[PDB]
Amino acid sequence: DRKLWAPGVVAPEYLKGDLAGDYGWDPLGLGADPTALKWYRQSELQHARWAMLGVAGVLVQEIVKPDVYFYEAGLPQNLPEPFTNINMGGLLAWEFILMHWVEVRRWQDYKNFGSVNEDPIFKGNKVPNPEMGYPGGIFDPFGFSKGNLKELQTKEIKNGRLAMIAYMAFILQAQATGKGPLAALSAHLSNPFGNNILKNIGTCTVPHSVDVQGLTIPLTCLWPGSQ
Amino acid sequence: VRPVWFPGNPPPAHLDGSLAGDYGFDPLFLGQEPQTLKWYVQAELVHGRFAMLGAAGIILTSIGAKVGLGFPEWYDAGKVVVEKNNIDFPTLMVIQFYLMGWAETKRWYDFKNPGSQADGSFLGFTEEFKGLENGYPGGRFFDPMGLSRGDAAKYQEYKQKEVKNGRLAMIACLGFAAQYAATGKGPLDNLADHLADPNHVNFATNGVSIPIA
Amino acid sequence: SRPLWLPGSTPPAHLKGDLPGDFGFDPLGLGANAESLKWFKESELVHSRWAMAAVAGILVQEIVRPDVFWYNAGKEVESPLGPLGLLAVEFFLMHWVEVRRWQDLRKPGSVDQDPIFSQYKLPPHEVGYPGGVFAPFIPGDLAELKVKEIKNGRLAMLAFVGFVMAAQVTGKGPIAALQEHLADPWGTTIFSKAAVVPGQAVAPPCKIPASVSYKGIEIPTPCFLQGLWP
Ligand code: CLA
Ligand code: CLA
Ligand code: CLA
Ligand code: CLA
Ligand code: CLA
Ligand SMILES: CC(/C=C/C=C(C)/C=C/[C@@]12O[C@]1(C)C[C@@H](O)CC2(C)C)=C\C=C\C=C(C)\C=C\C=C(C)\C=C\[C@@]12O[C@]1(C)C[C@@H](O)CC2(C)C
Numbered sequence: 001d002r003k004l005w006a007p008g009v010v011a012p013e014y015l016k017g018d019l020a021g022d023y024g025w026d027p028l029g030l031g032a033d034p035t036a037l038k039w040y041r042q043s044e045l046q047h048a049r050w051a052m053l054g055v056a057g058v059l060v061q062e063i064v065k066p067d068v069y070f071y072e073a074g075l076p077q078n079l080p081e082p083f084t085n086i087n088m089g090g091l092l093a094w095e096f097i098l099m100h101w102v103e104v105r106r107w108q109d110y111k112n113f114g115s116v117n118e119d120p121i122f123k124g125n126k127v128p129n130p131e132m133g134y135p136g137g138i139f140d141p142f143g144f145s146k147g148n149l150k151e152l153q154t155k156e157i158k159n160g161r162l163a164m165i166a167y168m169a170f171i172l173q174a175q176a177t178g179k180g181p182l183a184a185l186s187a188h189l190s191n192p193f194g195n196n197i198l199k200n201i202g203t204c205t206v207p208h209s210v211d212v213q214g215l216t217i218p219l220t221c222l223w224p225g226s227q
Numbered sequence: 228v229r230p231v232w233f234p235g236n237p238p239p240a241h242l243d244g245s246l247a248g249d250y251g252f253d254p255l256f257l258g259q260e261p262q263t264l265k266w267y268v269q270a271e272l273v274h275g276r277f278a279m280l281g282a283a284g285i286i287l288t289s290i291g292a293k294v295g296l297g298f299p300e301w302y303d304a305g306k307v308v309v310e311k312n313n314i315d316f317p318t319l320m321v322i323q324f325y326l327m328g329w330a331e332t333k334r335w336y337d338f339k340n341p342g343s344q345a346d347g348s349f350l351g352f353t354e355e356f357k358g359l360e361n362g363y364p365g366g367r368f369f370d371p372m373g374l375s376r377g378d379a380a381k382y383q384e385y386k387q388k389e390v391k392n393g394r395l396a397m398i399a400c401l402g403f404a405a406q407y408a409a410t411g412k413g414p415l416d417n418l419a420d421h422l423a424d425p426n427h428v429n430f431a432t433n434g435v436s437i438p439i440a
Numbered sequence: 441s442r443p444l445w446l447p448g449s450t451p452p453a454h455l456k457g458d459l460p461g462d463f464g465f466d467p468l469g470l471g472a473n474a475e476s477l478k479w480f481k482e483s484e485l486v487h488s489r490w491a492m493a494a495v496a497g498i499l500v501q502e503i504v505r506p507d508v509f510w511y512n513a514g515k516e517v518e519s520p521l522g523p524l525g526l527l528a529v530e531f532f533l534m535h536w537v538e539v540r541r542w543q544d545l546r547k548p549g550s551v552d553q554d555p556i557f558s559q560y561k562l563p564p565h566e567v568g569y570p571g572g573v574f575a576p577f578i579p580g581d582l583a584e585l586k587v588k589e590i591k592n593g594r595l596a597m598l599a600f601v602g603f604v605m606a607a608q609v610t611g612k613g614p615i616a617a618l619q620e621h622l623a624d625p626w627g628t629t630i631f632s633k634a635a636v637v638p639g640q641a642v643a644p645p646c647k648i649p650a651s652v653s654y655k656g657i658e659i660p661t662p663c664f665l666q667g668l669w670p
């Protein structure tokens with residue numbers, strides 16, 4: 001909680017540094033309810049980890065194959081050769097079921113903390129739980145914990161906040177200039193005064209709709225302007 | 228203390244946090260008298276249950292007409308029903324009023340006399356018609372699953388859910404009426420027109436709702 | 441304590457685990473009333489048993505006679521006993537047995553006695569589990585077998601519902617649709633036949649006709665809840 005988010009601000013009396021990355025920000029007072037603070041920490045960890053994976057994926061996907069737009073990589077006709085033009089219904093089914101399982105397990109760990117630790121088939125195997133949101137065990141196989149856990153949680157959540165900001169940046173850049181992260185960076189370095197957020201905000205390069213094997217996904221932008 | 232319709236405003240004394248869906252909304256003080264408040268409670272529940280049935284039926288038949296099944300819109304189904312089936316509308320209306328009059332007079336005279344309707348006069352049915360609470364008859368006929376019986380907190384949660392979905396369905400039926408009067412088409416036609424272009428297709432772009440432009 | 445449907449949840453106060461198949465599942469609290477719970481227990485048992493017999497029947501009918509669709513098997517038998525003679529026999533026999541079962545449901549100590557040969561009767565049993573002449577060669581403990589019965593029966597209830605909804609969407613029987621799924625796992629799901637988005641809705645059309653003749657009439661043959669289909 002020390003070294004807060006601003007020089008002259010005070011921390012709310014529910015943010016006292018017991019959570020990692022606590023700068024005492026909470027300007028909307030959403031974490032004033034401890035129940036809601038627990039749930040929002042879990043959602044923060046989820047958004048953070050998914051966004052770290054997301055920026056890693058967009059970056060490594062542009063580096064490995066710059067041939068493919070990450071904004072259009074979800075389209076089935078841009079999928080790799082073992083999966084090109086695959087039926088998105090069965091794909092969505094795989095994803096839906098396999099994610100329903102794990103996310104309901106995580107949610108039951110939130111509701112009753114320490115109740116879904118054991119494997120339900122091979123009932124000899126229990127994931128530990130130092131904290132809610134940090135299962136460990138098979139999720140910490142290299143064992144980087146049982147050391148500086150608070151410092152590693154701080155690193156995780158800081159890089160995760162940064163990755164959330166960075167992925168929304170990726171998305172908005174892809175919507176504005178129609179380019180990936182590194183493509184946008186190189187386009188800035190090519191002409192860093194005629195190619196910036198000016199002369200590119202106000203134009204959305206996302207189409208009004210996209211036909212995906214019969215469906216028409218509505219395909220909006222995060223702000224209005226130019227199709 | 229308790230959620231109010233107008234945060235900050237204290238609730239009126241006659242709206243204690245006891246009835247289902249009590250948010251202290253009585254600006255005209257219509258239910259200030261207790262017996263009048265019981266009457267209006269049963270009126271709200273009957274209105275909301277009829278409106279839940281009506282919204283569900285309108286929604287289902289609109290779904291059927293929208294996906295292509297053999298369904299008219301809610302504003303055309305009476306004519307279609309009495310003309311597809313050679314049904315005499317007077318006969319249907321008087322049968323409906325006979326049956327609903329029996330039912331609603333039983334309602335009325337259980338409200339006037341709660342101890343009534345359970346003497347065995349109807350067909351020997353005594354306890355099926357005694358009524359649990361005002362507006363919540365219960366029993367083996369009106370509550371065949373026994374959901375009022377057993378768990379009481381579940382029963383209160385269900386009362387809240389009932390009154391709230393009933394108010395939402397009353398608003399929804401008012402919306403169906405206004406949307407037919409404005410757009411001249413079905414409810415889910417309105418919804419599809421809104422989901423097509425959420426902007427430029429709403430009540431501000433009919434020329435009926437806002438006559439300024 | 442006991443295995444639950446949600447390994448972290450708390451079962452309702454009215455589900456103490458005494459009953460077979462009691463896994464704490466009553467999110468709506470339908471079995472909260474002690475009197476409604478007996479009726480729902482019996483209805484679960486008879487639904488389970490009817491659905492198990494019916495699923496086994498469709499499967500074995502599909503294996504023995506793949507020539508006939510189980511959804512159409514009502515109008516394709518052409519027995520010499522006509523439709524209405526069979527319907528009358530079934531009506532009266534099922535009326536007898538179901539009224540007997542119902543009389544055991546209401547007043548349990550009522551009907552264990554044979555109404556013809558007084559020497560034969562059922563031993564004092566539990567409602568839903570007659571026993572006696574209904575149960576020769578019970579193989580093992582009765583409690584675990586009641587649990588097995590109700591579990592296979594819930595599975596068979598879902599299996600008959602699946603037969604219905606995969607015979608209305610696919611028009612094929614259970615094993616035929618299973619082979620249809622094995623021959624195209626990613627394209628023959630219901631997710632790959634149907635999808636609704638905010639702006640369009642693609643539903644699978646029924647392979648069942650809306651009406652069938654059956655001897656001079658027209659039986660309405662509707663899809664279950666089409667329109668609500670995804
Ligand atoms: C006819 C339907 C009807 C009836 C009889 C009631 C009755 C009641 N409501 Mg409910 N209510 C309704 C519809 C109804 N409500 C709807 C649709 C909503 C959502 C907008 C609500 C939301 C609501 C809240 C949030 C609360 C109540 C409460 C109450 C109680 C106290 C107020 C009172 O005495 O009202 C008497 C009402 C009438 C005599 C009927 C009103 C008819 C007027 C005279 C005509 C004007 C209505 C309207 C403005 C016009 C729109 C349609 C028009 C364009 C044609 C009482 C039991 C309070 C409570 O404690 O309940 C337990 C409370 O907190 N109601
Ligand atoms: C959201 C809707 C809703 C809810 C929560 C309730 C809740 C309740 N009602 Mg009310 N009721 C409703 C709608 C609702 N009702 C409607 C529409 C009617 C008119 C038919 C009634 C008529 C009615 C009477 C006459 C009585 C009750 C009673 C009760 C209580 C016990 C039953 C129960 O637990 O219901 C739980 C409700 C649900 C779990 C909702 C089920 C969801 C349905 C099946 C969705 C599908 C609807 C379908 C499309 C259309 C159905 C058609 C219909 C003709 C069957 C409880 C407070 C009894 C009572 O108070 O006992 C003391 C009582 O006597 N209600
Ligand atoms: C149950 C809620 C509900 C829902 C989900 C919808 C949804 C929709 N309506 Mg409908 N509508 C409703 C209620 C509802 N309406 C009611 C109650 C009315 C009468 C005023 C209307 C009248 C209406 C018209 C005339 C039109 C729509 C249209 C539409 C569509 C676009 C939205 C729009 O134009 O703004 C309409 C949104 C509202 C009117 C607000 C929603 C209802 C509010 C929240 C009720 C508040 C009541 C309040 C709590 C108590 C009142 C008493 C108080 C004054 C003291 C959309 C599908 C348009 C359409 O067809 O799209 C193509 C259109 O032209 N609606
Ligand atoms: C009609 C068939 C039926 C009936 C009467 C029952 C009755 C019962 N079940 Mg069983 N059950 C069934 C089918 C049925 N079950 C199926 C198919 C499954 C597998 C999903 C289960 C799984 C199950 C578990 C795991 C447990 C029970 C338990 C119970 C008891 C408490 C719940 C209660 O009172 O609700 C009474 C239920 C009804 C009145 C039926 C509800 C009908 C509503 C109105 C419509 C439901 C529509 C449905 C959602 C559509 C599903 C189809 C498809 C989409 C899958 C009670 C004896 C608990 C128990 O044993 O405690 C003693 C328990 O732990 N049930
Ligand atoms: C749930 C019960 C059920 C129902 C309603 C049906 C209905 C049908 N079956 Mg299926 N079947 C079932 C279970 C069921 N089956 C089971 C469990 C099996 C596995 C043994 C089969 C195996 C089977 C085959 C192999 C064939 C059918 C066929 C048929 C059709 C004609 C039957 C006929 O001619 O009667 C003949 C009637 C009798 C032989 C008399 C009944 C036998 C004795 C008296 C025992 C009955 C009492 C006993 C205690 C069991 C009752 C308990 C329980 C079922 C409730 C008809 C659609 C035929 C078909 O495809 O038609 C096109 C066909 O070839 N069935
Ligand atoms: C989860 C996430 C991103 C996940 C991304 C994923 C999975 C990306 C996947 C893909 O890209 C790849 C990999 C490859 C592509 O081919 C395919 C897809 C699928 C497209 C972003 C979250 C992004 C989340 C963001 C940006 C959240 C920002 C939240 C903020 C700023 C909150 C602020 C406050 O709430 C506090 C903290 C305190 C309050 O009191 C005050 C305020 C100010 C309200």
Ligand SMILES: CC(/C=C/C=C(C)/C=C/[C@@]12O[C@]1(C)C[C@@H](O)CC2(C)C)=C\C=C\C=C(C)\C=C\C=C(C)\C=C\[C@@]12O[C@]1(C)C[C@@H](O)CC2(C)C
Binds near residue numbers: 255278282305397400
């Ligand atoms: C909106 C409504 C009532 C609104 C009341 C309000 C706002 C009251 C407000 C207040 O009083 C309070 C609360 C407190 C006071 O101090 C202040 C005010 C402000 C005065 C009732 C709707 C009530 C609406 C009802 C009962 C609707 C029933 C609909 C049915 C039966 C539909 C049937 C059909 O549509 C189908 C199903 C198929 C078709 O083919 C055939 C038909 C028949 C057309």
